[PDB]
Structure formats: C-alpha cells, structure tokens
Amino acid sequence: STGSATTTPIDSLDDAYITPVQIGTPAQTLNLDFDTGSSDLWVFSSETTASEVDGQTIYTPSKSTTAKLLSGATWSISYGDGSSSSGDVYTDTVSVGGLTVTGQAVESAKKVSSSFTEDSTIDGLLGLAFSTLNTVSPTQQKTFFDNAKASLDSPVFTADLGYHAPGTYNFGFIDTTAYTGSITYTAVSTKQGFWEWTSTGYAVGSGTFKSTSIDGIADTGTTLLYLPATVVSAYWAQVSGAKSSSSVGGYVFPCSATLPSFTFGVGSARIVIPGDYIDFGPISTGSSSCFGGIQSSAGIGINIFGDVALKAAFVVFNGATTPTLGFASK
Structure with missing residues (x-):
C-alpha cells in the first residue's frame, strides 16, 4: 500500500503545516501537524476542556462506530517550545492520503496549553519520530508510520514541504x-x-x-x-x-x-x-x-x-x- 497527502502552511510565514487525516467511521477529517520530532497522535476532541477549544475541529469518539476506549491508558506530552497536552486514549481507524491503519492509538486531549488553543488551524499532531518516544502509559503505543510499515510497498515516508506553498507527505514510495x-x-x-x-x-x-x-x-x-x-x-x-x-x-x-x-x-x-x-x-x-x-x-x-x-x-x-x-x- 501507499498514501499521499497534501500538506499546507497554516499562515503566511510557514509557521507550521497541516495535513488532512481521516479518523473513525464515518470519517471525521481533522487537520493535523505531522511532526517527525515526536511520537504521539493526539487530537482536540469532545473531551477537551471547553475553554481550551477555540475554532479547532474536534474528534468525537462516541460518533465513531470503530472507536474503542483503550482502557486505563493516559498520555501527557511537553514539547520543546514549552507547550503541552494530555488526556486519555482510543483506538480507531486512521487514514492518511488513502493509506489506512486499523487499531491506531488516537490520543484524545482533555487539556491543551494556550499555544494550542490559540492556533485554530491545528486540530492535533501526528507524530512520526520513533515509537520509543510515545507517551502513552502504562502501555506505550506505536506511531501511524510504525503501524502502517509492514503494509507499505517500501518502509519509508517522505516530506516535501513548500515555501509559502503546499507540499506533500508520501507513505510507502519515493x-x-x-x-x-x-x-x-x-x-x-x-x-x-x-x-x-x-x-x-x-x-x-x-x-x-x-x-x-x-x-x-x-x-x-x-x-x-x-x-x-x-x-x-x-x-x-x-x-x-x-x-x-x-x-x-x-x-x-x-x-x-x-x-x-x-x-x-x-x-x-x-x-x-x-x-x-x-x-x-x-x-x-x-x-x-x-x-x-x-x-x-x-x-x-x-x-x-x-x-x-x-x-x-x-x-x-x-x-x-x-x-x-x-x-x-x-
């Protein structure tokens, strides 16, 4: 299998890039920040503290027929810029650019720090570093790439980011x-x-x-x-x-x-x-x-x-x- 998705700058400075991701059944499309420096796939959700949501699209697991609570699992992450988020975990079907993973850990935010709240264009992160950095406890979870890997034509993904323009993330081919x-x-x-x-x-x-x-x-x-x-x-x-x-x-x-x-x-x-x-x-x-x-x-x-x-x-x-x-x- 392969996947191919367009990634788009969030603003005129290319401060970050968002890529549409389909989560759940029927699909809920969220725009996620693909992050090769972290290893958690987390989203704004129906569980996120209301005062900390300001324009983001949320994942509602109760509306997904394929969502399952990962019982007992929690997560909490802090990034290099001092931002942070935390919550609990569901497994669900996740698709990127036509590539589908079943049973992906989808980390549902209960709390997010102000920088996330203030960025209405970012609905969550999709980590693409190594799964050893994943923060889910007590059972560490795999990244989307790690889960997809065995099914990919080739065990690779590529980043082709644009300057003031859209670009592409591809999975499974060069x-x-x-x-x-x-x-x-x-x-x-x-x-x-x-x-x-x-x-x-x-x-x-x-x-x-x-x-x-x-x-x-x-x-x-x-x-x-x-x-x-x-x-x-x-x-x-x-x-x-x-x-x-x-x-x-x-x-x-x-x-x-x-x-x-x-x-x-x-x-x-x-x-x-x-x-x-x-x-x-x-x-x-x-x-x-x-x-x-x-x-x-x-x-x-x-x-x-x-x-x-x-x-x-x-x-x-x-x-x-x-x-x-x-x-x-x-």
Whole structure:
C-alpha cells in the first residue's frame, strides 16, 4: 500500500503545516501537524476542556462506530517550545492520503496549553519520530508510520514541504518526479528516539564550505533551523545590522535586508536554503525589525533541522531495519 497527502502552511510565514487525516467511521477529517520530532497522535476532541477549544475541529469518539476506549491508558506530552497536552486514549481507524491503519492509538486531549488553543488551524499532531518516544502509559503505543510499515510497498515516508506553498507527505514510495538530481542518504541514530543525523558542514551565502560535523534532528514540527552558536553567529555576521536580542528571544535583522543563503552538507552533497526562507517577518505588526529563521540551539541541548531547512529539500525518512535519512534538492 501507499498514501499521499497534501500538506499546507497554516499562515503566511510557514509557521507550521497541516495535513488532512481521516479518523473513525464515518470519517471525521481533522487537520493535523505531522511532526517527525515526536511520537504521539493526539487530537482536540469532545473531551477537551471547553475553554481550551477555540475554532479547532474536534474528534468525537462516541460518533465513531470503530472507536474503542483503550482502557486505563493516559498520555501527557511537553514539547520543546514549552507547550503541552494530555488526556486519555482510543483506538480507531486512521487514514492518511488513502493509506489506512486499523487499531491506531488516537490520543484524545482533555487539556491543551494556550499555544494550542490559540492556533485554530491545528486540530492535533501526528507524530512520526520513533515509537520509543510515545507517551502513552502504562502501555506505550506505536506511531501511524510504525503501524502502517509492514503494509507499505517500501518502509519509508517522505516530506516535501513548500515555501509559502503546499507540499506533500508520501507513505510507502519515493516519487522520483518530486526532486532533482540524486538522493543522498546518511546514517541515523535512534538512541534518543529522533531522526538524528550528522551534517557534514555549512556555508554562508557564496562563502567557502566549512567541513564540520553537526549532529541534529530532522524535525518537521519545528519551524526554524537551530544550530550551534558559532555557526549562527557566522551567518548573521553577514547581515548588516543583525543582532541577537534577549528581549525578542533571538536574532533579529533589519527588514530592509537581503538575506544570504545558507548551505548545509549531507555527506558530500549540499542543500541550499535560499535567503528568503530565513525571513520570518516583523517581530510585531508593523515593526522594521524582522525575526531570523536561523537561531542558536544553545540551551536547547540539540540542533534542530526544522522546516526552514527541510523545505529546501525532498527528504526521505527510511524506516528500514537500519533507518537512514535521504536528502535531495528539488
């Protein structure tokens, strides 16, 4: 089997991407944030505290003939940005882009933090990291990908995120029309439960490439590119007037700037992030200070190849017995 679903930016900054997902019988379609940095499939639901729902579409398990309470199971998750959610668990039928999993754990939110409430466009998350990070207790549950894997033509999914445009998540096949040149594959460590890999270095603009190992995660659920302070300082030093602002929470730059590109290495291959992808616009409405899309990972504890980086590439998440990651230009 295979699946193919379009993923769409939630706003004009590509802050996140939503993908329609069918849950239950008859289908209830919710728009979920596919997150390769976590491993819980959770949704706004008929159980979510009313005051914490503001425009989201909810899953109502009592209206699904295939929903079953997973008795005794609870979940609770905290994300890197400080947001959180928790609740109980149902199993139900879940379909993505024509690919169906029966018996998928659907984690129903009883509580969500303010950032979720405030984002009316995101009805929940669909985790695509390794199932060892799943938070369901006392019986840990498998991700949608893990459950689908044995049925897939090939044990892979791909992320093809757009810049200010829709893109695609495919399951079970590699669309050879969706990228240019060849795919370069690189080793993955699953020790922390992430799609963790080591970039071979970077360049700023038309500058020379610096060969240096940068360990980080491929994380579709993180907006920006978070890298070591040395790397980030070297990038922003090439933008007149750019500075790190503790009051704003990172690097800002004059909105009158033309940003240089940023290149990262994948083995001997190179992925180029155009300068425009690094512009996250005014820090507040009407400001002439703009927020940067490359930020320091210092104090996160991990480097994160978030959407800013991933959307510059066609990315293969290879879930074969020895997982790997592939990157191609597009």
